[PDB]
Amino acid sequence: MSNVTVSAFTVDKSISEEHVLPSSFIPGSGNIFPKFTSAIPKTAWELWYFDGISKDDKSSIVIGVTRNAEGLKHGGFKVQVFVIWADERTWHRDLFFPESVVSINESGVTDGIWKDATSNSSISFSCAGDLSKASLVFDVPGVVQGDMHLEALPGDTGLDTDARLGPSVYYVRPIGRASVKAQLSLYSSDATAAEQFSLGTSANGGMDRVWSPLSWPQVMTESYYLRTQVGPYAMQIMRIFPPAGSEDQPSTMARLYREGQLVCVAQHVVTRTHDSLILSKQDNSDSEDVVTGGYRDKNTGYTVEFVEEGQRWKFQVRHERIIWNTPTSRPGPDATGNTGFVEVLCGGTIGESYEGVGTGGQCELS
């Protein structure tokens, strides 16, 4: 091909002779192209993440497209698909492909394709060169078939901000705020039947972009993720507590937008100089429509305070529905695990009561 830059990872085939060079964080960029190209630390990983959640019916789709070093040796490159219907039924596969190819083409479009030529099966994504739009095609016969579309909402892109998440992780938000659609056919375990999934109306989400040379165990013991449009407000929170045996503070990459204007850029999480975030969890059973992780963390929700005589933004986060529960420990009375949530939100400034839904995920390593 001509004027097309490519990084091809094939299972059981060396990357040592890839022409393209590795990079770190590129300020002001989406950073969509892979960082580990011709050499990959044995613990390193890369993530292209997309989601959408409908406010009208709370259907939700969560996509995780990964590379890691281990994958090049053994087992391939994992793609995680999680869906929840309005009625709270859930569908989710971990799918592994032997080949992972990312492309920047002559137009400046970036394409990724995780594929298996043997099964004639693939999941791909495409990002416009101006990050106005991204889309995904699912084509795994008798598992998942369909697509997903994201349109960036007017306003600040937030790409001119720091993407460090503590000292060893990068977390860019290539599409911070987005309207999202999705039409999927999701097959049973035996591949004999299928159900239609249509993401509900008034759905927001986005695209995140994350890598580290270290495995997350060496990075975090706990993590919480939130993404939400709440009236004129949009926010993204990624908060981690540093690994066991560390004097480091909790790191955050938190952003608050108002009518598309970026109004708060927290890279510091505090309690009670720099834009900062308070993120404190609750256990009260105020209302009936509440739920919790199926592991040791029994929190029902969070309070989210953004602090700029600066203006003040507070939001209650109620866990209403479970998208997923996946373990990170043997079962027990003190088991840890990962939980995906349909989040319900309410707040803003003093006096304000805007309502939204959001995706959230909390992870604890044992």
Ligand X SMILES: C/C=C/[C@@H]1C=C[C@@H]2C[C@H](C)CC[C@H]2[C@]1(C)C(=O)C1=C(O)[C@@H](CO)N(C)C1=O
Task: Give the residues lining the site for ligand X (CB under 6 A).
Answer: 47, 49, 62, 64, 66, 80, 169, 210, 216, 219-220, 223, 225, 240, 338, 361, 363
Instruction: Extract the tokens encoding 139.
Output: 């084509």
Q: State in angstroms the smallest separation of the CB of 308 from ligand X.
A: 26
Least distance in angstroms from the C-beta of 94 to ligand X: 9
Residue closer to ligand X (CB basis): 220 or 307: 220
Q: In this structure, what is the dihedral angle of CA atoms 140, 203, 83, 172, given to the nearest 10 degrees?
A: 80
CB of 341 to ligand X, least distance (A): 10
Cβ 345 vs Cβ 227: under 8 Å:
no
Nearer to ligand X, 77 or 313 (CB): 77
Separation between Cα atoms, residue 163 and residue 170, nearest integer Å: 5
Both ends of the chain: CA-CA distance in Å? 47
Q: Are strands 45-54 and 60-68 parallel, antiparallel or unpaired?
A: antiparallel
Choice between 166 and 347, CB closer to ligand X? 166
Q: Taking the complex as a whole, how short is the minimal distance between the CB of residue 96 and ligand X, in angstroms?
A: 12
**Shortest distance (Å) from residue 241 CB to ligand X:** 10
CA 112/CA 21 separation, integer angstroms: 17
Q: How far is the CB of 141 from ligand X (least distance, A)?
A: 23
240/48 Cα distance (integer angstroms): 19
Shortest spacing between CB 216 and ligand X, in angstroms? 4
Handedness of CA 26, 31, 34, 36 (dihedral sign): positive
Q: Which of 104, 186 has the CB closer to ligand X?
A: 186
- Identify which of residues 140 and 363 has a Cβ nearer to ligand X in the complex: 363
Assess contact for 231 and 243: CB atoms under 8 A.
no
Nearer to ligand X, 225 or 295 (CB): 225
Q: Which is nearer to ligand X, 112 or 361 (CB)?
A: 361
Q: Tokens representing 25?
A: 């964080």
Reading the block at residue 15, the tokens are: 């990357």
Report the residue closest to ligand X, judged by CB: 64
Q: Residue 176: left if φ>0, alpha if ψ -120 to 50, beta else—which one?
A: alpha
| 222-230/312-327 β-pairing | unpaired
Instruction: Between 90 and 105, name the residue whose CB sits nearer to ligand X.
Output: 90
The three state secondary structure string of 18-72 is: CCCCCCCCCCCCCCCCCCCCCCCCCCCEEEEEEEEEECCCCCEEEEEEEEEHHHH
| DSSP three-state, residue 218 | helix
**Least distance (Å) from ligand X to the CB of residue 90?**
13
Decide whether 203 or 307 has the Cβ nearer to ligand X.
Answer: 203
Query: Minimal distance in Å, beta carbon 211 to ligand X?
Result: 9
| Breaks following residues of the chain (C-to-N distance > 2.5 Å) | 272, 308
